[PDB]
Structure 1
Amino acid sequence: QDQICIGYHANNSTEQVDTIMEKNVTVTHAQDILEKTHNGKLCDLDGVKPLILRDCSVAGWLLGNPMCDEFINVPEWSYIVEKANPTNDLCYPGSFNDYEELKHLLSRINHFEKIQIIPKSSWSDHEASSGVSSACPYLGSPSFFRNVVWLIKKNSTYPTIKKSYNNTNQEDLLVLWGIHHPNDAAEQTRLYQNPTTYISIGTSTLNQRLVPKIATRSKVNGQSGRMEFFWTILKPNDAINFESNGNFIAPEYAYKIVKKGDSAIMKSELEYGNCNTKCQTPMGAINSSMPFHNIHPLTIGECPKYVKSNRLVLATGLRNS
């Protein structure tokens, strides 16, 4: 006696999915949609290599910490990698004004071009090769941040400086300078004859006046004195004006901003793998077609969408047995 039956596919797949009422339901076909793997390397992003600061900070790099010569002339980068706690930062102790806002600026920058705006040789009436310290040693010898100059008195006189620089380039200019806060009055006269000093700085936008703070403080890297650093962005065709009768850490090299674009400052201890990728995290790169991942929130490049899941499997086929 003839017969006809209605039935459904079954196979030997052991792929399980979860539903709202039942966990670990075996199915015939399933699509996993969560990437859970990385290469453990820091890679170029689309052929353009990252900037891997080593044991230097952004400040040590920008100001030119003698220990950071690896980064004197840095090419175009995709993103910036900094370690959690860089060892080479402010060799001469002190502070950096609006450091975090500047780091934020670097997120939108992919290339600097270093240019000498006020040559160390142009100082006729001050000494310009004696602003060195054992707090910033280079090869066992007293030195200083390379992009600025610690000017000191010449022949027991520190004439007031009036210096101006007109940004003639077509790019925005990152300009850095500093003030020295000495530990005592004797030090003040010894370095800059004048007891009572100031540094004024003015642009079309900037109007500031610095006075050094002479005071006794605990020693960091052997110094009771402090260096305080400042920065600004000179617009194309705006000039920057400095006037000072002491304690002036003058700019010499500034940074043309020749490439704006997406970038990021990554915190990672990893170093440079010789590879290339489309998506980079602080713990490794991702090559996936997957829509989701669970590796790291802080991503850069053409990346899946981060999610805090350990498993995301979508049922496509039907119930097995």
Structure 2
Amino acid sequence: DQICIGYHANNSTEQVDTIMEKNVTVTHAQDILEKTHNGKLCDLDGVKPLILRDCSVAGWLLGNPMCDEFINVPEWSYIVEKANPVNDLCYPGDFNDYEELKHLLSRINHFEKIQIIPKSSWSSHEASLGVSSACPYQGKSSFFRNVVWLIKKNSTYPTIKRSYNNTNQEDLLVLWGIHHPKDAAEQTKLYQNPTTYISVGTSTLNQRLVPRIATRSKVNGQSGRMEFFWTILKPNDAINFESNGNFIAPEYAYKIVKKGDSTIMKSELEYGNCNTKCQTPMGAINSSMPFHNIHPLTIGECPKYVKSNRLVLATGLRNSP
């Protein structure tokens, strides 16, 4: 008669690593790394992202004619932009402090577009001939819809002096611009005055722009350039413009109604018709694992990202052959 002491074995082939030994077969194990995703861009907690498609943040905000899909976008959870969106600045130029603005957007979920300076109210200047073949719309020459390219009327560009007072409760994103012409002839052709400027002031802002002239290569068939600027006009503050010419005046500006958690996600993928609690640029995640290895840039309630191919903890004991 005997009694023996022993331990459990089973048919398990699960393996774990240790410092001294690799591929130890154990009776039980627990995988803690999520390796799969659905490969789609999805609603985050039901709230759809803003998918800019072929438009950039600039094309969107300035109102590139090809970006009318985003004329009045609802609240978003996150933003998706391609690596090289084709519909950027239709008329070539620069966007001043573009990156600092994109960063500002990561703290914004919703814009409300409103009119601050009507197009009709330019009674001393020509406001409806500010177009170009570089910005086409249905076969015809158009322009950034949110700003007004003003030119001379009956051979006269009188000094502009306009003021807008932010009577809204919300911070306001104001956009404007300056046109850099090809040569001296074009300057007088569009604006008459050979030496012009744009002065912009607010509570804090103290700007004065002058158009720079130079021979330039033709981007989208244009030797002229547009340099765009922005500011955040706080409530009860007023913005003041003064100019001799080359002024790209604001028509519409965006109210900042909702501030919160957001991000601009770089991805070539389109909308998945889909919902998730955790999104990556490669696809969404539905997992209870504490770790994943899909992509480092995520948004939502996510596992922690690691570069591992494999993380498996032993729970049971060394399994017998």
TM-score by length of 2: 0.99
Alpha-carbon distance in structure 2 between the residues aligned to 1:225 and 1:151: 15
Question: What is the match of residue 15 of structure 1?
Answer: 14
Task: Quote how far apart the aligned CAs of 1:215 are.
Answer: 1.5
Deviations 1:114-147 (A, max 9, x none): 0010010000000000000000010111110000
Tell me the distance in 1 between the aligned counterparts of 2:215 and 2:14.
71
Shift of 1:312: 0.2
**Aligned sequence identity (%):** 96
Cα separation, 2, equivalents of 1:299 and 1:241? 41
C-alpha deviation, 1:35, in angstroms: 0.1
The 2-side partners of 1:36 and 1:306 are apart by: 11
Shift of 1:188: 0.3
Q: What corresponds to 1:208 in structure 2?
A: 207
| Deviation of the 1:37 alpha carbon | 0.4
SS at match of 1:171: coil
Counterpart in 2 of 1:266?
Answer: 265
| 1:163-202 CA-partner distances (Å, limit 9, x unpaired) | 0000000000000000000010110001001000000000
Any unmatched runs of 5+ in structure 1?
A: none
Other structure's SS at 1:120 match: coil
Cα deviation 1:215-240 (Å, max 9, x = unaligned): 11110000000000000000000000
Q: What SS does the corresponding residue of 1:101 show, helix, strand or coil?
A: helix
**How far apart are the structure 2 equivalents of 1:90 and 1:160?**
28
Query: What corresponds to 1:175 in structure 2?
Result: 174
Question: Match of 1:68, SS?
Answer: helix
Name the CA distance, whole Å, in 1 between partners of 2:21 and 2:251. 70
Following superposition, the deviation at residue 57 of structure 1 comes to: 0.3
Tell me if 1:48 matches 2:47: yes
Where 1:121 maps in the other structure, the secondary structure is coil
> How far does residue 314 in structure 1 lie from its aligned partner after superposition?
0.3
Distance in 1 of aligned mates of 2:9 and 2:301: 38
Measure the CA separation in 2 of the matches of 1:215 and 1:274: 49
Deviations 1:239-262 (A, max 9, x none): 000000100000000000001000
Question: Which whole-Å deviations, capped at 9, do the CAs of 1:20-58 have from their partners, x for residues lacking one?
Answer: 010100000100000000000100000100000010000
Matched residue of 1:59: which SS? helix
Q: Does the residue aligned with 2:120 lie in a helix, a strand or coil?
A: helix
Q: Secondary structure at the match of 2:112?
A: strand
Cα offset for 1:75?
0.2
Query: Could you say what secondary structure the match of 1:40 adopts?
Result: coil
Structure 2, unaligned stretches of length 5 or more? none
Match of 1:276 in 2: 275
Deviation at 1:73, TM superposition (A): 0.4
TM-score (norm 1): 0.99
SS in 2 for 1:60: helix
Deviation at 1:212, TM superposition (A): 0.2
Distance across 1 between alignment mates of 2:147 and 2:15: 64
Distance in 2 (alpha carbons) for counterparts of 1:320 and 1:34:
23
Aligned residues: 320
CA distance in 2, matches of 1:235, 1:212: 28
Q: Distance in 2 between matches of 1:149 and 1:123?
A: 10
Runs of 4+ in 1 over 6 A off after TM superposition: none
Counterparts of residues 86-235 of structure 1 (less than 5 Å): 86-235=85-234
Q: Give the deviation of 1:76 after TM superposition.
A: 0.1
Q: CA deviation at 1:214?
A: 1.6
Find the aligned partners of 2:26 and 2:196 in 1 and give their Cα distance: 80
Give the structure 2 partner of residue 243 of structure 1.
242
1:276 CA displacement: 0.7
Deviation at 1:110, TM superposition (A): 0.1
Q: Separation in 2 of the partners of 1:168 and 1:89?
A: 31
SS in 2 for 1:178: strand
Question: What is the root-mean-square deviation of aligned Cα atoms in Å?
Answer: 0.4
SS at structure 2 position matched to 1:122: coil
CA distance in 2, matches of 1:257, 1:304: 31
SS of alignment partner, residue 68 of structure 2? helix
Distance 2:214 2:6 in 1: 90
Instruction: Supply the distance in 2 between the matched residues of 1:216 and 1:250 (Cα, whole angstroms).
Output: 25
